[PDB]
Design a protein around this ligand. Structure first.
Ligand SMILES: C[C@@H]1O[C@@H](O[C@@H]2[C@@H](O)[C@@H](O)O[C@H](CO)[C@H]2O[C@@H]2O[C@H](CO)[C@H](O)[C@H](O)[C@H]2O)[C@@H](O)[C@H](O)[C@@H]1O
Ligand SMILES: C[C@@H]1O[C@@H](O[C@@H]2[C@@H](O)[C@@H](O)O[C@H](CO)[C@H]2O[C@@H]2O[C@H](CO)[C@H](O)[C@H](O)[C@H]2O)[C@@H](O)[C@H](O)[C@@H]1O
Lengths: 306, 303
């Protein structure tokens, strides 16, 4: 049956699967203090999409719909539609629309709008607070704070394009909280249909993360953003749909110039990586290095230490 | 190695000329103007062309340090690469990889971090690619912003694009007019070639998106020759071309029925047999499938 592979793209050639920005580096660290349960960048090695994961990075943390002003304030409610402007279905068995933010934080960008009848357009700086009780994407609406109280029109197609994150408070880097899921239905109900939490189980192991730095837009935010799989790996597995022959795919990270293996890791078939290391470590890698699938192993495979 | 194209549907893919999803397929005449985009250019055997790079999220982004123009709201950015290292103007490319390849006013947010204390900031900003100060091949561009004092010198600064504006209707942007990458100081160099159908009865097939509009009455259509995912696929696979033309069938997998066939030229663009403007009608699960290597003279069934 179809041989399994991972892409040959280098880390810096790839994209974060949790926000529309490039990858910067590989990082491993302790996760015992967190529940690591992201909903974007979740895909099995056989190509089954999980959580809120969809196929292109450009759609992540984007929103579309019509807007109405909240009272006489600068806030606007967006009634969500799908990526292609068709109705959103809240009864679909997913946690929230595909691409919905999967962390608690205040994401800043531009809210843009076109008036269909005459082609007039407009844009305003806007922020969505995903920890707000008004963040209810599973129910079909989210709220934005904007720089206007009267320029947006009702009944017109409106898009939010994300740019970065903000923070407010004396406790610097206290938000965003990248490992805290929002309440997709607000106070109305609990989250449903989630991709599972992941954790290392084998002695001496940690998760391996693909790390980016989100742009900061105001205050003193925590800009670190870790994903479990690059977006290009999600797309690759989805298209290849190569069957998993065991629970774990052993990958070697290779320098293509010398041919030498730098380290090895375990790609679990449910779509995340562990390495043999303890503590925070920014991996020291050559920029042309890439991952290579070598063989099908089990969960108890003892890796060469990082 | 057998040549293939991705099995992704149109709406699962991204525009290779701006960081937005694909929406639809369009064919029309293009004899009256020059089709020479520089992003989304790649040969079927994986050679990147023009200003093309590998991820959609880096297109029309800019990074560098900024300095205010006088005491105005405009800022000059001295460009660096995606990972904050040197841009070399002597490299034989038209401009940095990912540079905009149309004349227009692109609006987004200009963001900055002060490294010493982690303070951050963001301001609405526009880059006019038809401006004499749009000189990315020289290493700099100019932004008009909504501040005249908040940006600091010597600090990492990023422009994230969102959409386009217009002044004066739908007269700008001009998607098929390349900017002058060196301004008035020199002519464009090292360009991916202009494209045109050569076989009678054929037209280009375009992968189309709508750029968000941010002010005025802009022309929001944006057509690319190859989805970004196809660029990335060919780059990785590097499958040899057995002729100059790959025959693709667009298939509805619900039925196994072929909806239309098209020619994917080795140098990286598609033609169909049709005369006139046409918005293609496709099922949501439709996709392109490579069937065989043929020649410039193979007659396509009418689209
Ligand atoms: C940390 C600063 O963040 C940005 O400024 C903030 C505004 O975006 C908004 O949220 O209001 C707060 C408080 O009014 C702003 O913070 C103040 O900004 C000034 C500089 O203009 C001083 O730095 C104060 O100490 C901040 O409290 C951003 O525009 C600014 O440059 C800073 O990064
Ligand atoms: C077409 C309008 O575009 C946007 O408004 C423009 C501003 O973004 C800025 O460029 O200044 C111009 C002219 O002062 C603005 O155009 C006017 O906007 C008013 C409404 O505020 C009227 O529509 C005029 O006819 C425009 O000339 C945008 O915010 C606005 O909603 C319109 O789409």
């Amino acid at each position: 049956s179809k041989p399994f592979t991972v892409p040959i793209l280098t880390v810096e050639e790839m994209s974060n699967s949790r926000f529309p920005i490039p990858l910067e580096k590989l990082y491993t660290g302790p996760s015992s203090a967190f529940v690591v349960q992201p909903q974007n960048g979740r895909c099995t090695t056989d190509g089954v999409l999980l959580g809120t994961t969809q196929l292109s990075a450009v759609n992540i943390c984007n929103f579309r719909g019509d807007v109405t002003r909240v009272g006489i304030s600068h806030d606007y409610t967006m009634n969500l539609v799908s990526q292609n402007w068709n109705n959103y279905d809240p009864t679909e068995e997913i946690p929230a629309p595909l691409g919905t933010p999967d962390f608690v934080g205040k994401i800043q960008g531009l809210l843009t709008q076109t008036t269909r009848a005459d082609g007039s357009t407009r844009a305003h700086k806007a922020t969505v607070s995903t920890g707000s009780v008004h963040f209810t994407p599973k129910l079909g609406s989210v709220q934005f704070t904007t720089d206007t109280n009267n320029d947006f029109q009702t009944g017109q197609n409106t898009k939010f394009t994300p740019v970065g994150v903000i923070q407010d408070g004396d406790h610097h880097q206290n938000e965003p909280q990248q490992w805290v899921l929002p309440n997709y239905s607000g106070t109305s109900g609990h989250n449903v249909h989630l991709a599972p939490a992941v954790a290392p189980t084998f002695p001496g192991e940690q998760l391996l993360f693909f790390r980016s730095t989100m742009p900061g837009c105001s205050g003193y935010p925590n800009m670190n953003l870790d994903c479990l799989l690059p977006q290009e790996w999600v797309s690759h597995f989805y298209q290849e749909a190569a069957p998993a022959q065991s629970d774990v795919a052993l990958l070697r990270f290779v320098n293509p110039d010398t041919g030498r293996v730098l380290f090895e890791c375990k790609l679990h078939k449910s779509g995340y990586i562990t390495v043999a290391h303890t503590g925070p470590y920014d991996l020291v890698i050559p920029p042309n290095g890439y991952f290579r699938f070598d063989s099908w192993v089990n969960q108890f495979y003892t890796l060469a230490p990082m």
